[PDB]
Amino acid sequence: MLLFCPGCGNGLIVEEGQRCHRFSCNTCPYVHNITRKVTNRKYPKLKEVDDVLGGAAAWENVDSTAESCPKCEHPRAYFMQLQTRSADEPMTTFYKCCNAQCGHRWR
Amino acid sequence: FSIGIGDVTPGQGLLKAKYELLNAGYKKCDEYIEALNTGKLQQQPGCTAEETLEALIL
Ligand SMILES: [Zn+2]
Ligand SMILES: [Zn+2]
Numbered sequence: 001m002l003l004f005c006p007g008c009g010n011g012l013i014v015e016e017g018q019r020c021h022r023f024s025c026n027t028c029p030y031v032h033n034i035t036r037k038v039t040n041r042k043y044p045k046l047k048e049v050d051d052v053l054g055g056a057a058a059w060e061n062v063d064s065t066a067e068s069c070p071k072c073e074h075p076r077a078y079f080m081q082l083q084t085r086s087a088d089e090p091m092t093t094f095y096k097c098c099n100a101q102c103g104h105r106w107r
Numbered sequence: 108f109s110i111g112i113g114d115v116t117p118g119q120g121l122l123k124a125k126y127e128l129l130n131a132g133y134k135k136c137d138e139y140i141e142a143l144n145t146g147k148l149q150q151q152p153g154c155t156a157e158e159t160l161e162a163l164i165l
Contacts, residue, residue: 051153054152105149
């Protein structure tokens with residue numbers, strides 16, 4: 001991330017000093033000792049999973065005492081939650097039922 | 108051998124069926140628009156959702 005000097009407002013660079021790594025200006029004496037953990041997360045966009053889950057994928061989210069699907073009232077359905085974009089998104093819930101003489105897609 | 112305006116004029120059996128077809132097609136198009144904008148639209152494979160809407164409307 002860009003961080004700028006309170007004095008002159010040039011762009012800081014990271015360098016190493018005699019006790020710590022420092023943010024330092026190139027044109028004025030201002031330096032800032034990195035005393036503790038500092039971070040910057042990108043969170044990029046992941047791949048689309050819409051066609052990845054269709055067609056009997058290797059799902060695993062099913063559990064004992066899981067709810068039956070609301071239409072068929074049988075537990076013959078898988079359900080999963082995934083982030084569709086980056087992992088700061090709250091996970092969405094979705095489910096699909098596949099039974100004899102019964103094909104449907106639900107949300 | 109001649110052609111006139113009586114030869115391209117539509118009868119009654121067309122003017123009923125055209126009205127029924129336009130009403131049915133515009134209802135199904137409106138339901139697809141509503142299924143995209145404010146709900147779930149079943150995305151066709153290999154494309155975005157708007158291209159699915161374009162394909163269904165065409
Ligand atoms: Zn500076
Ligand atoms: Zn089923």
